[PDB]
Design a protein around this ligand. Structure first.
Ligand SMILES: [Mg+2]
Ligand SMILES: [Mg+2]
Ligand SMILES: [Mg+2]
Ligand SMILES: [Mg+2]
Ligand SMILES: [Mg+2]
Ligand SMILES: [Mg+2]
Ligand SMILES: [Mg+2]
Ligand SMILES: [Mg+2]
Ligand SMILES: [Mg+2]
Ligand SMILES: [Mg+2]
Ligand SMILES: [Mg+2]
Ligand SMILES: [Mg+2]
Ligand SMILES: [Mg+2]
Ligand SMILES: [Mg+2]
Ligand SMILES: [Mg+2]
Ligand SMILES: [Mg+2]
Ligand SMILES: [Mg+2]
Ligand SMILES: [Mg+2]
Ligand SMILES: [Mg+2]
Ligand SMILES: [Mg+2]
Ligand SMILES: [Mg+2]
Ligand SMILES: [Mg+2]
Ligand SMILES: [Mg+2]
Ligand SMILES: [Mg+2]
Ligand SMILES: [Mg+2]
Ligand SMILES: [Mg+2]
Ligand SMILES: [Mg+2]
Ligand SMILES: [Mg+2]
Ligand SMILES: [Mg+2]
Ligand SMILES: [Mg+2]
Ligand SMILES: [Mg+2]
Ligand SMILES: [Mg+2]
Ligand SMILES: [Mg+2]
Ligand SMILES: [Mg+2]
Ligand SMILES: [Mg+2]
Ligand SMILES: [Mg+2]
Ligand SMILES: [Mg+2]
Ligand SMILES: [Mg+2]
Ligand SMILES: [Mg+2]
Ligand SMILES: [Mg+2]
Ligand SMILES: [Mg+2]
Ligand SMILES: [Zn+2]
Lengths: 99, 124, 208, 150, 138
RNA sequence: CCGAGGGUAGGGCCCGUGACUGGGGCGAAGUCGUAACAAGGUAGCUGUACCGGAAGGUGCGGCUGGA
RNA sequence: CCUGGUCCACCCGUGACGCUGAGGCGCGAAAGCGUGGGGAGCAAACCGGAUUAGAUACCCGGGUAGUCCACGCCCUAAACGAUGCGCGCUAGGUCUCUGGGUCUCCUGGGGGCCGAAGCUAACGCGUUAAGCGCGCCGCCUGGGGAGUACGGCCGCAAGGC
RNA sequence: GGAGGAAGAAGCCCUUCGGGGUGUAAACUCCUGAACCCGGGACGAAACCCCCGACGAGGGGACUGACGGUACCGGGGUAAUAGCGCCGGCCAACUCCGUGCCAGCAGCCGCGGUAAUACGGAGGGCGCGAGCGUUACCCGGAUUCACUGGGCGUAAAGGGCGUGUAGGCGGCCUGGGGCGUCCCAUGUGAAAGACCACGGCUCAACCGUGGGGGAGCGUGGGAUACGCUCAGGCUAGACG
RNA sequence: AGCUAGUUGGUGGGGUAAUGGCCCACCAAGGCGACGACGGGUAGCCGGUCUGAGAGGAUGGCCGGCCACAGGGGCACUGA
């Protein structure tokens, strides 16, 4: 089964591509508590039809370019910039962490 | 700590200090005597313990103890080193394996002899 | 090997009398029947209370010294029972008892457990046909522990088979004295075995 | 009259102008091995005396140990202040595995099968008290649902 | 602001009994009911009714204790000696059915929520299911 | 074209080592003093500041683990 | 004059909008630093008088920074309740501050003492928990070496982390 | 080596100078026969290949062994190697002499200063045995990094105090989804090892066979209490 | 504690058994990081193995599976 995944488009600033942030949950190998973790995938978008903040499905696709091995399946719900903030702030927080 | 804290920080594994760098975690190290002196015990003791500074094969150099009564070790004697300190001579942290290379046995010893490397004798 | 030295000396020390000798221990002179005190220079001395360890030691030491067996084998056995399903107390005996150099002694053939071994080792004994010189050999249920043709005609198997005639033997056993050939009928129950040892303490000496 | 095994003896001492005086202490357990066990602590100007006093309080303060197959009904933990104890029942034919104290008690408790562990302060005395209060706090399918009538 | 209302209730209970008390009133909830509906069905309480304290709907829960006692501290034994929550809010605990606890050697109960109702250690084992091990009582 | 590597030049980290130097640990019985523990013989501790062979002293504010 | 927090009473509005909080930011006693004022009393340093074996001290006579102010730094402490914060639950007695009431009484917030139950190694704690529970942060893991070294960041420095 | 052998050799060791001990141990008596001596001597080896049949399916016949004259079987047959560790406490095993904070012991706590169960030798005892000790390292005891399963008033440990970002945590009721969660099915989870049985070698170690399991993860179906998400309501929290 | 110039992506080519910035032009300015990027140290990974009540901790010799290497380093030829 060509692995699938659901997640938010965080970057749309690429030629025919998007960055889908994927969250995943799971019970923790010694302390039990479910823990949230996440990874970004670069998603082939040959129609630039996908915009910023769309929660989408992605399929394990054939290699399109280095780093890019997933096509955008279908849309799941446009307009979720509330999560895009959560990401962008996590990011912006990084400046305070250096010297 | 809270569960979450553990999930963040996590528990810290101990890790312990090799009480003896006889190098390459070897059973014993070969070495040559450099000094062959007699040092004095610590707090509530008194004596003249027989010891040897030994040049290791590993470029190192350690003081080491001479077990038993009497010995035959000079400025150039090749010897085997065992490693167990001596709660009494600050510094000494390896023992000399009595009976290998220039290290004699213990003359006239009939009791525990594995230690002290004196051969079994004849009753005649 | 099987100890091999002063025997009526554990007969001593261990207190409780034992029959490492067969006949003489029956005398009025097992040295036990004369000095009921543990060997050595001291012996006759105000005994100090045995540390809880001492106890546990001796118990196993007694048991062990009985079957004249290596601490190794003794131990291998124990563990075996522990692993084997069931009350490890009994079973450790069951196999302790299932030993060939024991079954032979149990079925009269020999006078002492030690004398027995030598018989078995020298293949003077046999089993279900083929001869077996394995003191360690673990005899199962339903086996023919015979003597060897060559071994019937022996001055020593004779006398030791002698007083045997008609003397009733263990419940887990049978003895067609005529054909000088005994049988192992089952694995003995805890009671069937009577020996001066609390099996518990042993189980415990190994929980150290 | 019961079993009466003597857990430990100690020479304590106090000061006073001139020198140091003494005193001896005695933890003693006591049992018939039908589930009746007793613990007693005895201190007196002399070793012999102390032990005497031990059995005496012991016989005074004992408890019904609701055995079963020679073991115990259910498992328990008990802290007595600093010192904790684990009592966990074992299948027929295990053995009584514990330290001098918890065993010395559990033996004349008439137990045989029981897994145990000291935890926290392993103070003989305080472990002792733990071992009892542990027992005391035992229940059986019976006296359990006896409380869940209605 | 109550984090886990249950471990609260559970405690309310625990606390009331240490002094031995007619009843006590956990603020109501269909789930706190369900749970209570098992302490009682299992004989840990007399039971419970629904009530009110200023339009505020709690649960009157009537405790159960033992017989008086002779000697000093004649205070009764407890019907509920021990009651400590599992699967907490800061760390849910779940269980397959083979993973289900065997409380106090049968003498105890492990209440626990599941897809087919709030069963118990035996009720679950028998119904052949598992789920959020809610707590252990005895 | 790229290319093993060689060369020139300039950086980064790590190890060993070095006249001399700073304190630190240890060393059955050394010199000077008595700081602290009893109102410790000026209550003690304390952050800071200054000062003195040394412990330490004194100023300021603070704690009682003092009165 | 400008302004913060906070309790009560009426049950009016919003309808969970909450709790905690790595980093971040702000505040942060005294002493100390910079620029400029200010300077009576006190007072490190320092000078003398005593005491003393000595007396770089304690006691006495003097006395400069500083103590004050404005602005900018410094960021430490027995910064102490040596007790993180929020919430629910678990006897009362007493006195006390400050609110509300068909006010010898009741009820709400705060500050003390004694104490149920319970916790506690003990001392003690105890509706102002160190009880019984849940959430979240912080921290500990033998003494000395040592809050030292190196590195790093911060500071004019002292020095801080 | 096994059975018998003294109210119990000598020698040595204690000794209250009666005695005690090593000790049935030895001697010594009998029978058993590791070694070695002689003969006999494999499983492992039945296919390829040849005849018939068809060079196939089926049938028959023949060659081939390194180890190896080894294992093993049978006859004869000699009493035929013991050592190391420890004996203050943990921790089983005690007395003499030597020694005199010396010589030395030592994992810890400590021992030795003229009467040492702690050094050194001896007798004796404890332990294990073709081994016993030592050194080095791993896990254990260590519940001493604590999920199971610890803590912070004074023992080590609450940030000098706020504010708040991320994150962690989330009150009452209704419903939709069913991600967590739970159950069922199927695939996978090689074998070897481990474990339960059974047998193969004289036992065992080794070794064959058979069975039984394994969290995980993919797939299909189901459940909807608790957690999540979306939707509606409430007012006990919070705010006004 | 910041990292990155084939660097991230796109168009078209080259290349291979085949996808792909693997490679090459051209275009765009992206990609990654406290859920720890970058860097430094150590290490072949697993089936297993030792230990432990277990949860864990330790470990990867023999045997089995996979990877890597063949004095150090590069390269291609022949070829399924
Ligand atoms: Mg000394
Ligand atoms: Mg020695
Ligand atoms: Mg406690
Ligand atoms: Mg170059
Ligand atoms: Mg002072
Ligand atoms: Mg003084
Ligand atoms: Mg003073
Ligand atoms: Mg000061
Ligand atoms: Mg001064
Ligand atoms: Mg409304
Ligand atoms: Mg806050
Ligand atoms: Mg300040
Ligand atoms: Mg100031
Ligand atoms: Mg100034
Ligand atoms: Mg003055
Ligand atoms: Mg003045
Ligand atoms: Mg204060
Ligand atoms: Mg502090
Ligand atoms: Mg805080
Ligand atoms: Mg009040
Ligand atoms: Mg009080
Ligand atoms: Mg009050
Ligand atoms: Mg320090
Ligand atoms: Mg400092
Ligand atoms: Mg620095
Ligand atoms: Mg002893
Ligand atoms: Mg000696
Ligand atoms: Mg163990
Ligand atoms: Mg243990
Ligand atoms: Mg551990
Ligand atoms: Mg925990
Ligand atoms: Mg602790
Ligand atoms: Mg402290
Ligand atoms: Mg504070
Ligand atoms: Mg938040
Ligand atoms: Mg699902
Ligand atoms: Mg397998
Ligand atoms: Mg590239
Ligand atoms: Mg390597
Ligand atoms: Mg463990
Ligand atoms: Mg090469
Ligand atoms: Zn005898």
């Amino acid at each position: 089964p060509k692995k699938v995944l659901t997640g938010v488009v965080v970057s749309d600033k690429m030629q025919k591509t998007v960055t889908v942030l994927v969250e995943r949950q799971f019970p923790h190998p010694l302390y039990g508590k479910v823990i949230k973790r996440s990874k970004k995938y670069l998603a082939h978008d040959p129609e630039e039809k996908y915009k910023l903040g769309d929660v989408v499905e992605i399929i394990e696709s054939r290699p399109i370019s280095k780093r890019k091995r997933f096509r955008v399946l279908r849309l799941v719900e446009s307009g979720r910039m509330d999560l895009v903030e959560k990401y962008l702030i996590r990011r912006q927080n990084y400046e305070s962490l250096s010297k | 700590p809270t569960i979450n804290q553990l999930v963040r920080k996590g528990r810290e594994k101990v890790r312990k200090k090799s009480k003896v760098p006889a190098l390459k975690g070897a059973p014993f190290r070969r070495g040559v005597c450099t000094v062959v002196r007699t040092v004095t015990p610590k707090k509530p003791n008194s004596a003249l313990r027989k010891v040897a500074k030994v040049r290791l094969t590993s470029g190192y150099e350690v003081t080491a103890y001479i077990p038993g009564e009497g010995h035959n070790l000079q400025e150039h004697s090749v010897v085997l080193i065992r490693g167990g300190r001596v709660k009494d001579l600050p510094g000494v942290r390896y023992h000399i394996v009595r009976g290998v290379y220039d290290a004699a046995g213990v003359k006239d010893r009939k009791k525990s002899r594995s230690k002290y490397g004196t051969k079994k004798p004849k009753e005649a | 090997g099987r100890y091999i030295g002063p025997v009526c000396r554990l007969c001593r020390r261990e207190g409780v009398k034992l029959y490492l000798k067969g006949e003489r221990c029956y005398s009025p002179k097992c040295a036990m029947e004369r000095r009921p005190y543990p060997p050595g220079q001291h012996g006759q001395k105000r005994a100090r209370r045995p540390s809880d360890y001492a106890v546990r030691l001796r118990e196993k030491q007694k048991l062990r010294r009985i079957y004249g067996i290596s601490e190794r084998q003794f131990r291998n056995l124990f563990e075996e029972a522990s692993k084997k399903k069931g009350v490890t107390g009994s079973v450790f005996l069951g196999l302790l008892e299932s030993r060939l150099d024991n079954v032979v002694y149990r079925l009269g053939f020999a006078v002492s457990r030690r004398q027995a071994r030598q018989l078995v080792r020298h293949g003077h004994i046999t089993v279900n046909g083929r001869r077996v010189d394995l003191p360690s050999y673990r005899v199962r249920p339903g086996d023919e522990i015979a003597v060897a043709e060559k071994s019937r005609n022996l001055e020593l198997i004779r006398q030791n088979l002698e007083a045997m005639k008609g003397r009733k033997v263990g419940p887990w056993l049978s003895l067609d004295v005529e054909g000088m050939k005994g049988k192992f009928l089952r694995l003995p129950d805890r009671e069937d075995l009577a020996l001066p040892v609390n099996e518990q303490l042993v189980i415990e000496f190994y929980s150290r | 009259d019961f079993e009466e095994k003597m857990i430990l003896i100690r020479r304590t001492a106090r000061m006073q102008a001139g020198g140091r005086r003494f005193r001896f202490g005695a933890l003693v357990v006591v049992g018939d091995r039908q589930g009746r066990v007793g613990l007693g602590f005895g201190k007196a100007p002399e070793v012999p005396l102390a032990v005497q006093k031990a059995g005496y309080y012991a016989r005074r303060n004992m408890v019904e140990v609701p055995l079963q197959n020679g073991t115990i009904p259910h498992e328990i933990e008990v802290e007595f202040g600093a010192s904790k104890i684990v009592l966990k029942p074992a299948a027929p034919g295990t053995g009584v595995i514990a330290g001098a104290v918890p065993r010395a008690i559990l033996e004349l408790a008439g137990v045989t099968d029981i897994l145990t562990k000291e935890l926290g302060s392993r103070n003989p005395i305080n472990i002792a008290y733990a071992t009892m209060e542990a027992l005391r706090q035992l229940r059986t399918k019976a006296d359990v649902e006896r409380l869940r009538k209605g | 602001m109550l984090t886990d209302p249950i471990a609260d209730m559970l405690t309310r209970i625990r606390n009331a009994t240490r002094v031995y008390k007619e009843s006590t009133d956990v603020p109501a909830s269909r789930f706190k009911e369900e749970i209570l509906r098992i302490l009682a069905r299992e004989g840990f309480i007399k039971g419970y009714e629904r009530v009110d304290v200023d339009g505020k709907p709690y649960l009157r829960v009537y405790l159960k204790y033992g017989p008086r006692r002779q000697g000093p501290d004649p205070r009764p034994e407890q019907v509920i000696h021990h009651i400590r929550r599992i699967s907490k809010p800061g760390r849910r605990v779940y269980v397959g059915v083979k993973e289900i606890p065997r409380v106090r050697r049968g003498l105890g109960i492990a209440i626990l929520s599941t897809s087919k109702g709030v069963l118990t250690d035996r009720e679950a084992r028998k119904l052949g299911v598992g789920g959020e091990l809610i707590c252990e009582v005895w």
